[model samples]
Target: HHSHMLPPEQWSHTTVRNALKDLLKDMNQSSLAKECPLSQSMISSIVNSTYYANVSAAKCQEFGRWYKHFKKT
Candidate 1:
């Protein structure tokens, strides 16, 4: 058997965007804005495109953790 998991910091923009898209499919802009580290517009922009070069590592890491917890419920 094989596993395909990778470190949170190693996740690519494409991966993050796709995951974020799914996580936000049923949510509203205001709800997404509550993430703190990133704004609603920032999340929308990233989900709509693959631009993460200017985003901080800490923010990306937090997003990753949030997504995990989001999926659990």
Candidate 2:
């Protein structure tokens, strides 16, 4: 119910998965490059987190909000 941006009604499991693949590719290529100690495996683990699932609606909403903001810019 706390969803923002695209909102839960506008999203589906498949759409979220596809968006995640793209985000993972981007992370592997750059994103965390500026970190003092970067590890692709760690990035992989982060992306693999179950928070992607709407099990915790709040977490899903936060991801969607951030994803939408970054996608626009």
Candidate 3:
């Protein structure tokens, strides 16, 4: 018999969000540095500003797609 799949909260949305957020900040600082170097002050500015909405949406969507594909393995 196939094993029962667990509920989504077993997945912990907050934990997932934080992990993706950390990864994005690092990517922003490194490989995507072409996108933005994101200094400490600039990071604060983005946090204090509305820029996070667009950036977070794009990055998190990419992450969700990647996560779904990953879990199938």
Candidate 4:
């Protein structure tokens, strides 16, 4: 039931942060950075507060997809 983006219920950062929290639990961090998002560590870094930077929403969506797949597996 938690596959898609939740409505922007006025708290986006921390919510995505929590989602990122569990996403790291779902799969291998190295492979996630190596494979998904076509080999971009932008997600792993930014969401986890490793290297905060602005990533485009367009590319971020792909990482989101992999998060769900990892969770399902």
- Please, what is the whole-model Cα lDDT of each candidate in the order they appear? 0.61, 0.50, 0.42, 0.53
Instruction: Put down candidate 1 lDDT per residue, 1-73, tens digits, no spaces.
Output: 0133344676555556666666578776567677534677677677665445346667777666666555554
lDDT string, candidate 3, 1-73, tens digits: 1123222334343434444466565565344334332334534444455544233434445444444444454
- The C-alpha TM-scores of every prediction are 0.59, 0.45, 0.30, 0.45
RMSD of each: 4.1, 7.3, 8.6, 4.7
Candidate 4 structure lDDT: 0.53
Which residue pairs does candidate 4 place in steric collision? none
The per-prediction tally of clashing pairs is: 0, 0, 0, 0
**What's model 2's lDDT at 63?**
51
The model with the greater TM-score, 1 or 4, is: 1
Best by TM-score: 1
Output the TM-score of candidate 1.
0.59
Candidate 3 worst ten-residue window by lDDT: 1-10
Better of 2 and 4 by TM-score: 2
What is the model-wide C-alpha lDDT for candidate 3? 0.42
Which candidate number would show the highest lDDT if scored against the true structure? 1
Model 3 segments more than 4 A misplaced: 1-15, 18-55
lDDT of 2 at 64: 58
